[PDB]
Symmetry: C2
Subunit: 141 residues, 2 copies
């Protein structure tokens, strides 16, 4: 719908930052659409990824980092707060020690920092969703 | 680019039919974009799938059917003729006993019929590609 997908925005993150995303899966859960959010160290898409978050709707969530070109230790969750056929609101907050992912207001996943959030230069949101809102907060010193 | 994605077209298939697709992945292979082609028994996206073909570019190909709502025996291939950053031409021919998948003119995958091709009513092409051509042949009795 409204925003282009794949969606790319330059971004800066530190403790207290929040990334808020509103969107809808492009297919029913039976067909297993995906959602992916990547926090990149450069504007180039092949750059390293401080935080990789990939939803297989209805099935599982996988999180990882890509450091010097190489995927690291994948963590997997079967927690699935997303609802079939529904619009979702996803917020990723940068806490001192981790990212916290809220889905529709509910804390759903966390991921300890492997690289300082200050290394992030770009956020990409892609795979099988439409996007109506993307926001990064910039109020903190 | 030119065609909408997810792309849905009503279709009829029998021995001698060919489905030809021309497109480009939306991301470099390092980021593992997907391509999926599904031959459905009805126009509804939740309908059964006579032939499910899913490319994880640079990694693997998975093929299956979905019968009465349930995924069946998955077959996996590591054959990867698709080239990083390149446009591809994919053709799926309906042979008497199987689907044959050509990639850029090269036979690359086959999949024995689990359900008669006559059950197909719809083809959907989706995931992380742009599409410039989709054609189904209709010349045979």
């Amino acid at each position: 719908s409204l925003l282009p997908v794949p969606y790319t925005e330059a971004a800066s993150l530190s403790t207290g930052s929040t990334v808020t995303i509103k969107g809808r899966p492009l297919a029913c859960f039976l067909n297993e659409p995906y959602l992916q959010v990547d926090f990149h160290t450069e504007m180039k898409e092949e750059s390293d990824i401080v935080f990789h978050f990939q939803v297989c709707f209805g099935r599982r969530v996988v999180m990882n980092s890509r450091e010097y070109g190489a995927a690291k230790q994948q963590v997997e969750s079967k927690n699935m707060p997303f609802q079939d056929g529904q619009e979702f609101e996803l917020s990723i907050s940068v806490l001192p020690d981790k990212y916290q992912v809220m889905v529709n207001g509910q804390s759903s996943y966390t991921f300890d920092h492997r690289i300082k959030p200050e290394a992030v230069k770009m956020v990409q949101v892609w795979r099988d969703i439409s996007l109506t809102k993307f926001n990064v907060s910039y109020l903190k010193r």
